[PDB]
């Protein structure tokens, strides 16, 4: 059985870019998936996506141009106290200049920089760079 639908979409995207391709259909388009694909386009790692409507769980077609090195999901949605968010960025982000480590908080899914801006925290979702 599929366990973390987010991963089955993220990994396909990562696979789809080193393949050279610039389009990939991801399944099965969860609400969390769209609220993640949204944050990536907010920083320009992907382009535009379209929510196909099967009468089933869904489908998404996302166009990525050339800018993502590694998108990823963190399986245990580890709870991150605001005091150790820096500890994550350090472990999985190329440099403190760029790259965002998305997470889920009470204030809604948001990247780490936006999370530090609003001073709110939650569990970690993944990262993108």
């Amino acid at each position: 059985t599929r366990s973390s639908v987010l991963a089955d979409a993220l990994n396909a995207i990562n696979n789809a870019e080193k393949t050279g391709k610039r389009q990939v259909l991801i399944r099965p388009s969860s609400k969390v998936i769209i609220k993640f694909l949204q944050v990536m386009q907010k920083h320009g790692y992907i382009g535009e996506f379209e929510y196909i409507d099967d009468h089933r769980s869904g489908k998404i077609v996302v166009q990525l141009n050339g800018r993502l090195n590694k998108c990823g999901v963190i399986s245990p949605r580890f709870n991150v106290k605001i005091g150790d968010i820096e500890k994550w960025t350090a472990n999985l982000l190329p440099a403190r200049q760029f790259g965002y480590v998305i997470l889920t908080t009470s204030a809604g899914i948001m990247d780490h920089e936006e999370a530090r801006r609003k001073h709110v925290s939650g569990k970690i979702l993944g990262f993108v760079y």
């Binding site: 399986s75 245990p76 949605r77 580890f78």
Partner: protein
């Protein structure tokens, strides 16, 4: 993800799994079973003073051919008998 369970609630298995698997570490096992005190004629101490029983000359292992001067010592705090080498050529005349 080959191996270990990753769920956020598998902490009990992870800790007991490592506890069990740590027995493969000889330093960890020797320190837990306590061989230092049971085995190991020194009582786990840095040194142990004893009494010399006889002056032995031990043929060196190969590919060497010498006669290592040692002495069989009977630990006073333990009664155990142990053969120990006398370094610093000469020094066998000093054991007495």
């Amino acid at each position: 993800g080959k191996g270990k369970p990753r769920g956020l609630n598998s902490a009990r298995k992870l800790r007991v799994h490592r506890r069990n698997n740590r027995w493969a570490e000889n330093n960890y096992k020797k320190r837990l079973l306590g061989t230092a005190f049971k085995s190991s004629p020194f009582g786990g101490s840095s040194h142990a003073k004893g009494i010399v029983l006889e002056k032995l000359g031990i043929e060196s292992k190969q590919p060497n051919s010498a006669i290592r001067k040692c002495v069989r010592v009977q630990l006073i705090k333990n009664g155990k008998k142990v053969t120990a080498f006398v370094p610093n050529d000469g020094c066998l005349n000093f054991v007495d």
